[PDB]
Design an enzyme around this catalytic site. Structure first.
Site, PDB file in Angstrom:
ATOM      1  N   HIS D 280       0.850  -1.190   0.000  1.00  0.00           N
ATOM      2  CA  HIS D 280       0.000   0.000   0.000  1.00  0.00           C
ATOM      3  C   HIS D 280       0.887   1.242   0.000  1.00  0.00           C
ATOM      4  CE1 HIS D 280      -3.711   2.261   1.295  1.00  0.00           C
ATOM      5  NE2 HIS D 280      -2.776   3.108   1.686  1.00  0.00           N
ATOM      6  N   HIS D 323      -0.940   3.632  11.587  1.00  0.00           N
ATOM      7  CA  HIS D 323      -0.022   4.725  11.302  1.00  0.00           C
ATOM      8  C   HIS D 323       0.161   5.684  12.470  1.00  0.00           C
ATOM      9  CE1 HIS D 323       1.248   8.100   8.271  1.00  0.00           C
ATOM     10  NE2 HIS D 323       2.292   7.393   8.665  1.00  0.00           N
ATOM     11  N   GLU D 329      -2.538  15.238  10.023  1.00  0.00           N
ATOM     12  CA  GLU D 329      -3.449  14.796   8.976  1.00  0.00           C
ATOM     13  C   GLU D 329      -4.878  15.268   9.218  1.00  0.00           C
ATOM     14  OE1 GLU D 329      -3.010  10.563   8.193  1.00  0.00           O
ATOM     15  OE2 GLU D 329      -0.897  10.667   8.737  1.00  0.00           O
ATOM     16  N   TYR D 338     -15.037   7.003   2.254  1.00  0.00           N
ATOM     17  CA  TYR D 338     -13.597   6.768   2.282  1.00  0.00           C
ATOM     18  C   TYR D 338     -13.308   5.333   2.749  1.00  0.00           C
ATOM     19  CZ  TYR D 338      -8.671   7.181   3.656  1.00  0.00           C
ATOM     20  OH  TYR D 338      -7.324   6.984   3.793  1.00  0.00           O
ATOM     21  N   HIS D 353      -6.028  13.857  12.807  1.00  0.00           N
ATOM     22  CA  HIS D 353      -5.090  13.005  13.515  1.00  0.00           C
ATOM     23  C   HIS D 353      -3.765  13.749  13.588  1.00  0.00           C
ATOM     24  CE1 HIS D 353      -7.649   9.717  11.419  1.00  0.00           C
ATOM     25  NE2 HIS D 353      -8.219  10.077  12.554  1.00  0.00           N
ATOM     26  N   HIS D 359      -3.416   6.269  14.422  1.00  0.00           N
ATOM     27  CA  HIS D 359      -4.593   6.094  13.582  1.00  0.00           C
ATOM     28  C   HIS D 359      -4.451   4.881  12.683  1.00  0.00           C
ATOM     29  CE1 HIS D 359      -1.825   8.795  11.551  1.00  0.00           C
ATOM     30  NE2 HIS D 359      -2.399   8.538  10.389  1.00  0.00           N
TER      31      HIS D 359
END
Ligand SMILES: O=C(O)Cc1cc(O)ccc1O
Ligand SMILES: O=C(O)Cc1cc(O)ccc1O
Ligand SMILES: O=C(O)Cc1cc(O)ccc1O
Ligand SMILES: O=C(O)Cc1cc(O)ccc1O
Ligand SMILES: [Fe+3]
Ligand SMILES: [Fe+3]
Ligand SMILES: [Fe+3]
Ligand SMILES: [Fe+3]
Lengths: 426, 425, 425, 425
Positions: D280, D323, D329, D338, D353, D359
């Site tokens: 990813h 993450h 963010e 989303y 975040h 997160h």
């Protein structure tokens, strides 16, 4: 048997006897095991640390213990550059010679940025060998990138042993001694000899901090030394010439070592391929595995780029490479399967050269299939092609231009391209 | 002789009061009826830190000259030697019997390129037995001079400086000068820099003082000549000597200002940095001057010295480590002995260790250092140096056929023993 | 405890065999049923040489936690002190009586900005008398720890390291850890870096070896905990301690790979470089780690040490020269005595000489050094250091009100005599 | 409406033939009796790649205005909220009942700095129910507009552009404009950039094509108003609205040329790049526009989108990895859903975040992504985005007390199970 240390660019440390590495310093007055400390400086001392390559060696005998080098009679690289020629060229695979030929004797110069006697930029060869090396060799003219196509290699280097098969690549630092053993009796593959700034991972830009070739996958061998007493031949390549001296010991006598100037290998099957997940056909710089920069920002000495198994999902798009004219110079080879852009004539072991501003692109057949295709997600598989792309023009050697394997009518592959232009129907 | 100090300064010197125009460079009618001339040592558009340019106020414009003509005598036209990767060592060069001034006596030792296509660095050893009865400029590069025997009195356009062994001097490309031999004969080394001008190294953690301090770089004050009579003007262009005859002295600059200057430096003032703990620092630490390339960190050449210094490293092999290097190491010797080589390396001698050639201390230096009782030891009465270049140095044909080339250099390493014992750490 | 060596390495470590995915970072089903989690120490788009990021393979994602709540106890809430340009010196800090674990014991000394708006560097002295019974992370910056009394055992997400006086340790921003006091109590210094991560200095002429050698930076091997039950997780954010309660240990990382890592370094291994001739080198030469700004050459902070070292400078005033500096100099002392001060500066003490404040050796040290017979002298059994910052350091109200703050530090220069004689050069 | 194409072009547009001076910028007597006026968007001395300036040929000069006076109504006067490290999510914003034009309707969500000292980035959500009967400019920064509901007709000094959800628009600092609501009401997002102007990211290996193609950035053609009659001119300066009254239209530019221009961009034209193998990729790979700092690689803010896209990663966990980030963010949503958040995140909503907050995908998304049998999959009918900033984003007091702030965002991760089996790779 063979263990490896991972992480491109790492300050590595390896010892084949416990405590063989001096602790807390590089140059003890009395080295552990009575070994000699030797520094191999792959770069100027004053490089920024990110660009430093250097390795401390702790070895049985100093490299300086050698008699005068002498020029060998046998010289595989002494052939002149070919004439000027702007044409698009393609070679069929190179046969392996009948006569005894080891790894260093078997380099066939294909094309290069300069003559062998004044190395600069990149030199490109195809190697064909039918004997293991019964000597040790170092290349004073540049760093070596090896791309095996047929047959596995065991490469014994000063820092340890590595094995490489097709679909893997290997890099040997300038000046480092090694011996190439053939595991399958004979071997054929491609070489890019880099005379400029050492290969390294490309700047990733928006791709960020992961992807393409991940640095965890670059493997360096662990320490290993030999104690064989008796005559050993040491050959060096200097200004294109093979010179040699005879030692009475094995020069692969490094019991321990630490630092960043290291041989390494990489498995292209591990490449984290990035491409379009929408439409159009991304610039093939997006497939960059390793790159050698110049002092001109963004213009590489050479990019090593691959074309691997990959998903093709581009919608309403002409999926094969677009017709192209490039400032850069495009040398492609093929490790296995077939390359998407060329229907016939480009085989594993083969090669093509499209020099500066030469008009290239997918051949007639490929083009025709691509426009007619009904587009759905498609996985290209069972193939691995690659390109050495160089900023300087690549001059074909005379041998290459005289090669029986040089195909005579490569131009015909584009000859049947039709006009489909109709100014009346958008 | 008087000097102005400060490496890289914007200097200003006038031989007659008010000879420099005040508040401008190009007055319509210049003081004393002099002619303004600009010597652009760099492209106009260099960043200011890189800029070298000098304004000259002179009796006759340099443009006043007849056509140059190629001289028959060409000291630098010999071929390049053949390919040879070997470690090389030369004994001191004897001074020729034939009459030979400074420019006539450059023996080409090794260079990055042929003389007709100057690139990077060309290295020579000069031998001279006559003072120059003419004036010279080098269109091909900047000159770094390293005297080994005999003092030089160097008359340049910007004034006169004297240099003796243990000092160095630099003459900018295109600058006219004339060399007088104070001791009758002279011998020394030359690095001809065809690339970016030499400058002080970036000091990194050493900070804002140390190594060569800029206060020690000395430039001569203005001095002009008024000889009327025929003077030969010689220039080195693409390796060749070309000449014309003038009817005046071209060393007729009455005043000048700017940054493109000849200078000298006394190596005995080097603030030598070294280890004060253990191990043996990279020899880049002894850098005096350096010529950069567009590749950050990789010099065209570093000029490095090995001066009198304190050795205090504890539990350390104190001589240089065995070494193999991307760069190319050309070493010379000004006086005394160098610590890495027991015998065979004398003042006026040279060694060349090319890219990746295996070098290091000879067998004798090795035995002694391992058995040595470590304690503070002042190395003294020596001065060696290195020209380190990034491009390979090709020995000239002359250097390879030189009677002074040592036949058995590799034998100094021949007796290195194995002391390896797998059973005893 | 085993460690991995090499400053800035892409490391790989697994506590169970094959716990690291091979050939990718994000398998659909990770070995052992672990969760992939990325710790991005820097923007994704940094040049690779500046990239800091670590992949973690853990039992529960960090995202599994309830809302954080502000604690009543706030060690770092005190205001910045008043404006004061004076030279400051503190005696060692006493360990408080009430229970104080590692994060509860930071005494704010001086900082570039108020704790609620972190910028530059914040400096603290830690005092503790209890091991932590919770897990902590610092969202405000990287932590440089310099133990002065007592060994620390530090359990981090990446593994466990132990640190003792003469060693230093760094914990990256956002990384979770727990501090156990091996000796019951502990005292030391903290540099909290809010700016670009600490790294090895460019060595300039020193080259490719020396000062802090990268092989000496050690990173712990993977280690995970499985204790279920309640665990307090605390974070420092904009100066405040916020906490939540977990039902698992957040130190549950079974395998990891990458370059955003805690590490330690033994200052005794520092390859000290200095003068081997004369003069006194700039203390930047003692740089261990440095945090840069976007202004090349001007660090956010330099971490510099003053270790055992040979002093051999000839005809030289060997102590530090008298100095006024754009930068701001905060000094500490881990053991022994510092060369510039004769009394008053003790292990655990601190001095602050701010922008353009006149500092230098005290009268006593100065007198002795001018009179001394000079010879090779080994400074031994001492370790002082400096946090040097480009932004001014504002002492806290707590620091200005401190009983440990010395009242007459100025007096140590009070007796400097004139010795000027205009008739005797 | 007609447009000119090409991000960063030197454009030229005239609404009367030959109104642009030919061959110069500043004629003594300009065509049609117009006034020349220079809008310098950057310092004069920026490198040309960084330069933004536009020459205007206008009916009256902008200097013709009375004194500005502070408005009583101040939409952005509320203070920063308290310190809060928590993960935050807001539901979509309702449109207020009171009359509220475009600039009256900015609701501050989070910002790097208090409004009175603009720095870095400030984030808002706009809600409006009236078209503007007045003209506005922003002295505090460049404006990036992201419509979510309702179309805008934006009259600028350089011409008129229309913008709908799925397109973005940028207005340079200081440029005057008036917003008409084509649909009666509008709602959307704003990134107010106080730093270096937004531009296309360096593409790295992506090369010379891809992501946002420059040909797709459109700029309006010249359009002027001749009306005489009262018009209010408002500016935002240090967060406050100040106004003066004109008796003419400030949108009176008959002709212009240069590079400092309003523009728009259709997000549907984004040449999305992603993985065609596995894993990813970092979401930086979705960068549309970026605002740099003097720190290379570390943006002031990146504007990043999550568009319809092919998902082919094999043997991969396809949603975002768990993450923790140095960067901050802020996410929004233009339409659809989303991928990382099953519920709670709607068009018009938002998440923050902040630095080192943990997160990642919610438990629902995570569970499903591990179980799914992987095949090529086109995510579609969605457009989300992120404003990622390097400086911390402090939520406004208004946003912290907002009824739309979700009380239990943390709950979305609370059911994450341990699937660890140490005895089973
Ligand atoms: O196929 C080629 O010969 C090389 C090539 C590959 C590609 O992806 C785009 C352009 C191009 O020339
Ligand atoms: O002695 C030499 O030949 C040159 C040399 C000097 C030094 O300090 C380290 C290494 C090296 O090769
Ligand atoms: O002694 C000090 O306070 C620090 C210091 C050390 C040094 O080597 C030179 C100058 C200086 O201020
Ligand atoms: O979903 C998020 O909150 C943002 C996000 C997107 C992505 O592709 C990777 C990581 C990440 O945090
Ligand atoms: Fe191409
Ligand atoms: Fe060397
Ligand atoms: Fe100081
Ligand atoms: Fe994220």
């Amino acid at each position: 048997d063979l263990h490896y240390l991972s992480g491109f660019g790492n300050e590595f440390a390896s010892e084949a006897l416990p405590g063989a590495l001096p602790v807390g310093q590089n140059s003890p007055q009395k080295a552990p095991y009575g070994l000699y400390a030797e520094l191999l400086s792959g770069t100027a001392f004053t490089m920024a640390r990110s660009e430093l390559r250097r390795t401390w060696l702790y070895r049985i005998r100093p490299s300086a213990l050698h008699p005068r080098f002498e020029r060998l009679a046998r010289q595989p690289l002494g052939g002149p550059l070919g004439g000027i020629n702007p044409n698009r060229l393609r070679w069929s695979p190179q046969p392996i010679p009948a006569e005894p030929t080891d790894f260093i004797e078997g380099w066939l110069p294909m094309a290069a940025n300069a003559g062998a006697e004044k190395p600069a930029g990149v030199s490109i060869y195809i190697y064909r060998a039918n004997r293991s090396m019964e000597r040790v060799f170092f290349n004073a003219d540049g760093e070596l990138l090896l791309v095996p196509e047929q047959g596995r290699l065991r490469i014994a280097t000063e820092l340890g042993v590595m094995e490489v098969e097709p679909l893997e690549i290997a890099v040997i630092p300038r000046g480092m001694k090694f011996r190439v053993e053939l595991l399958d009796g004979q071997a054929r593959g491609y070489i890019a000899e880099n005379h400029g700034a050492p290969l390294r991972l490309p700047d990733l830009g928006p791709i960020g901090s992961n992807g393409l070739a991940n640095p965890r996958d670059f493997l360096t061998p662990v320490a290993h030394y030999e104690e064989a007493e008796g005559p050993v031949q040491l050959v060096q390549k200097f200004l294109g010439e093979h010179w040699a001296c005879e030692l009475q010991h094995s020069p692969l006598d490094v019991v321990a070592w630490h630092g960043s100037n290291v041989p390494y290998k990489y498995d292209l099957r591990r490449f984290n391929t990035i491409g379009t997940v929408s439409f159009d056909h991304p610039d093939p710089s997006i497939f960059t595995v390793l790159t050698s920069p110049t002092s001109v920002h963004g213009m590489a000495n050479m990019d090593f780029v691959i074309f691997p198994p990959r998903w093709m999902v581009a919608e309403n798009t002409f999926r094969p490479p677009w017709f192209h004219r490039n400032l850069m110079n495009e040398f492609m080879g093929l490790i296995n399967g077939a390359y998407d852009a060329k229907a016939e004539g480009f085989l594993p072991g083969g090669a093509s050269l499209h020099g500066v501003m030469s008009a290239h692109g997918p051949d007639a057949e490929t083009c025709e299939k691509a426009i007619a295709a009904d587009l759905a997600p498609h996985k290209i598989d069972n193939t691995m092609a690659f390109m050495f792309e160089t900023s300087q023009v690549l001059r074909p050697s005379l041998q290459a231009l005289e090669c029986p394997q040089l195909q005579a009518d490569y131009d015909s592959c584009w000859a049947t391209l039709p006009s489909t232009f109709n100014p009346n129907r958008r």
